[PDB]
Write a protein that binds this ligand. Structure first.
Ligand SMILES: [Ca+2]
Length: 223
């Protein structure tokens, strides 16, 4: 997260870190056994880390649970990043509490202008590289489809939306990938892509979660 703020320990209880010996992506807990992340975060050997603040220190509220299965969206295209969504099932159900909690799926899509909370452990620099160890947060509005398409000609599909600031300086970044965009208590987006980070006229692009609720529910119901 570039130009954000320190969330505070366990203030974003649905935020998970995906770990393969190191943090590599964010995710969102959507029930006791399932996490939503980005398809471009797919790899084998995933451990889901819940209840994290400082990802380099055991602080007492963590649950570390290995993934039993991961399911990339059937229509994910790694070239275009269309359908950039995946589900990860935990080998055992997380113990849900005030600091480890699921986030609700949308019942309808969010509109341009809606304010959302974006979070993660990604790079905090727009030029250069600095990884924080505590969770960072950014409040950002969803942008209109037309401004999103104008920002990224030929690249925005019906499964993507832009959020952030066209002036630059405030954005998600590398390492925030797969993490949440939550608006009015609903998971509306997944950190997907962007040109650099926090660059003028290059806002963050996010997977449009409301398009996938039927797939998520049906997949969970049979796996
Ligand atoms: Ca920790």
């Amino acid at each position: 997260i570039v130009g954000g703020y320190t969330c505070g320990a366990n203030t974003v209880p649905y935020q998970v870190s995906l770990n393969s010996g190191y943090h590599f992506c964010g995710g969102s807990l959507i029930n006791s056994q399932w996490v939503v992340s980005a398809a471009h975060c797919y790899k084998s050997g995933i451990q889901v880390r819940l209840g994290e603040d400082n990802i380099n220190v055991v602080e007492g509220n963590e649950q570390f649970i290995s993934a039993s299965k991961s399911i990339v969206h059937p229509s994910y295209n790694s070239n275009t990043l269309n359908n950039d969504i995946m589900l990860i099932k935990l080998k055992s159900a997380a113990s849900l509490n005030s600091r480890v909690a699921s986030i609700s799926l949308p019942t309808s899509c969010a509109s341009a202008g809606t304010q959302c909370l974006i979070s993660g452990w990604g790079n905090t620099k727009s030029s250069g590289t600095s990884y924080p160890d505590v969770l960072k947060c950014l409040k950002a509005p969803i942008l209109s489809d037309s401004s999103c398409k104008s920002a990224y000609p030929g690249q925005i599909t019906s499964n993507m939306f832009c959020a952030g600031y066209l002036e630059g300086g405030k954005d998600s970044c590398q390492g925030d990938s797969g993490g949440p965009v939550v608006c009015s208590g609903k998971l509306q987006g997944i950190v997907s892509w962007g040109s650099g980070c926090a660059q003028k006229n290059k806002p963050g692009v996010y997977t449009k979660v409301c398009n996938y609720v039927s797939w998520i529910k049906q997949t969970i119901a049979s796996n």
